[model samples]
Target: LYFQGLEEGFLEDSRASLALRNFYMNRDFRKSEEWAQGFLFDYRSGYTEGTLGVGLDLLGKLGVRLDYARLDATAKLRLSRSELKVGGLVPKLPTIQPNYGRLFPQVFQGALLTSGELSGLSLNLGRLTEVSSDLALFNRNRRFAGAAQADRFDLAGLDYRIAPDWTGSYHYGELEQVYAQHFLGLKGRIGIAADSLESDLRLALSRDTGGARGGRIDNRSFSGSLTYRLRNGQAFGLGYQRMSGDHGFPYLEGTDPYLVNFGQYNDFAEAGESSWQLRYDCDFAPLGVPGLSLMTRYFSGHGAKPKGADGSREWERDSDLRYVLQGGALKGLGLVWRNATYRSAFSRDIDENRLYLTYELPLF
Candidate 1:
């Protein structure tokens, strides 16, 4: 016989944690320069034991300025291999991943249903009705309530692994009064020359439509490229991206794109932008330094025709180095330094640097 923690409202699997993050950022713009700290305390409960089960998830967010505080909760249900989550969600998908570049993530009000009945395949269906960039994600006296001003957001997608080296994806998104975007992507990797070399490719197509909002939205963008790696932990990647029509690519704010050349410092998203990139990465393990790595890249965009401005061009150079503790009490601690510079004829010129540290500690 098993003794579950049913003594406390089916809290057998409940977990509580506190996360602290401190950050300093310097932007070319004065108003954007800042130093901040954040804390996250959360509790998640396991579903009650039964075919039909329920649970509750809660989170509390606090910021150093005392200007931000949030309390969010979600009700969950599970039946067999299927699950439903409603109230608020943090979504991660090709077409709809939230922005985590800031100290705290932007969150949405929504519901999601997931099913895993089919082998090698999974499905997701959901809708987001509201968004909060600086406050509670769930319903409450949430500040920044109309940040996106999105009438609504709908997303549906599927992921299927076809083979050891290949996968397929398809998804659709409808953002009201904003834009209706569609995405198609394919990724594959294979070994060559007796496994000493490997090749990889990723591609995506995004088109704006269905009552394009806020401006005359006529855009078509595509990302298609390849990469290769050497057995010695040296990897190189080169790719191309094209922006057609008179507008730049469209995506949610603060989210990363699948584009191969969206570099660290800048996205270079502007009307009539055409760009390409070259990147290199090396692991230091072969150099007698495990848990260390180095990366650098450059991207150049020409023929950018931003609205209310003449045609222009721009470029970015970025690099980063990271190291992690491999043993001892700080076994998982990590530190990183990143640098980026952007010079453009169509936008502001700027140089930026960031240094950060991370560690994880558990409490019982």
Candidate 2:
């Protein structure tokens, strides 16, 4: 499944915003199953300029099960607020429920206040309504019950472009039983040889804590990727990521299943584990295939400490061929072929392939 956002700003100078999203999954590439689907809508009005320019934001959502039998036993069809529901496909006709129940859609609401500015910095503090990142993985796709829904929450952050080629940001937030988190990020790029080749560096860290009866899980992660271009339209990349803590990295519940770079040949999710990766990318546009590209990567990690298993190891290999229509009736269509395999000395071995198709049209 995937989560997406689209927005439109209001009249000039007055910040007005609108966003709509849908999250879904399909099994065996079959249309009959209707694995899962969630929908959301959000809007915000610009702040009134002043010493403390204040603005208001709002968000709404709807989550439902499209085809029940195709869902996992651990999956629920009900629309309960925060509790888990058993799996099954029940049709939703004529929506409206006074109390929570299975086979119904779930709803969420949120609001926020944002400041105008200070040099290059702005701040936001508010209650969150929809959650998109928590349900998937970095760049891979795997469906699970761990996904969290939109709820009452708080967040604050800032973004700054230190220089023409350097940028950074900081964010912190909490979502009830899920956890509270703090994030820091920095990125910079350097140009060389008349800008034919560019190199980049990025770093990030996070701290987490389970709300109430939840366990205490803390994690630190780092990732770096660099790309160099050749005069012949080919480019090469190298990337690496490492994680450390007593527990695995915590993401929005259903988020892991949609990662592309989860691992080189394995997923580094076991306690006390780390991973490394290398990647390569190529473009054929200069050669006449404007919207086509190829990418491949490998990842490997060891030092896994499974709950009951002895020290284990895992690895993965992934590749993708993607294309987008440059113009015409299908100008915005996108097609992708993704394939990967994961093996672990511990247990849970996986081999999977997926084909993704998407397109966008202007509503205005």
Candidate 3:
């Protein structure tokens, strides 16, 4: 998977703003595997100085599962706001399954508009093209879920940055017959040194009206990450997160698709769950081994409610080693190795390892 950002100039001045894109593919060595791809384009341009800035957004997606022999024939692709699933997999697919032939290439399409700043506060009113973020709690790495599907829905929100280190936002959106939601978020940061150490904190609350699902769910999450520098190019971080909700943290479908934070021994993602995480990272450049680094994390959670269990427990441990070729015929090339394991009291157990290589080559 890849995360990227585009500047306005990248798309020209044609009433365009910046864009973010994520793309990936997944292969299961034993069972069935799948290929997934998605893109999100956002544009912002004001109508002159008219007190309002108009904006537009576009979202696209495509997914296909190969080697279905391992899966039952009754299985089919199902899309949710933040998750996707095979119909025959444990839970059933939703009633509104997109036509594979048509949706395979054009999954979701929508537009959005925003109003410029009004007294330092900005207003955004329109449809939600897609929802994606780097935060672990609400990560949606191209996965499947019954309640977390995306739609051509309506949305509106307000954002205010009272200070350089403090910001807040409120948002509401509706997907007919599926669900409606309201979200509130706050973020702040503090600098310990001129440019050496920094700490950041984020908190979010969401209330969901489960449309036809017959219940209202509320989710509250908090996360914090601190980065500290030790002599040389060495740095270390401590991160933590917790979530409390009637159900698992909700997000758009086909996201996080990796199951990264499922927790060291379990996939703490269940109804009424709580989890915590710890992490460490280091750069070897100062030791004369430039362009090399290592990172690892461990997480655990309890009080989860899966279908047949009174309560569930889960945990996960993950690590990565990465390197970049600083010089040579293959300069600028990057290589990474990722390893993870997950186990739970109420769900499946998984062990995974991946090796990724990437490089940039100039064509012109």
Best by lDDT: 1
Against the correct fold, how does model 3 do in TM-score? 0.60
Model number with the top TM-score: 1
Question: lDDT per prediction?
Answer: 0.68, 0.47, 0.46
lDDT of 3 at 16: 28
When sorted by lDDT, best at the front, the candidate numbers are 1, 2, 3
Evaluate model 2: give its lDDT.
0.47
What tens digits encode model 1's per-residue C-alpha lDDT throughout 1-364?
1223234444666788777766667677413566667778777887786667788888778877416798878888876667788986778877666665566776677898887667777788888776663221111111112223365778888878888777778777666655556677777877876433333343344443454443345556777667777777778888777777655666665456556667766666565678888888899987789989999988999988776555478899989888989998779777777788888886667788766566555542
Off by over 4 Å in 3: 1-108, 114-123, 128-151, 194-200, 213-216, 226-232, 257-267, 361-364
Query: After superposing candidate 2, which stretches have Cα over 4 Å from the reference?
Result: 1-109, 112-116, 129-151, 195-211, 229-233, 254-267, 326-331
Per-structure clash totals for the candidates: 0, 29, 43
What TM-score, computed on C-alpha atoms, does each candidate reach?
Answer: 0.84, 0.63, 0.60
Model 3 per-residue lDDT tens digits across residues 230-309: 66666666655555665555543432211223332333456656677777778899888989999888887777666555
Higher-lDDT candidate of 1 and 2: 1
What's model 3's lDDT at 342? 70
Model 1 TM-score? 0.84
What's the distance in Å from true for residue 59, model 2? 11
**Which segments of candidate 1 are over 4 A away from where they belong?**
1-10, 29-32, 65-67, 133-148, 193-211
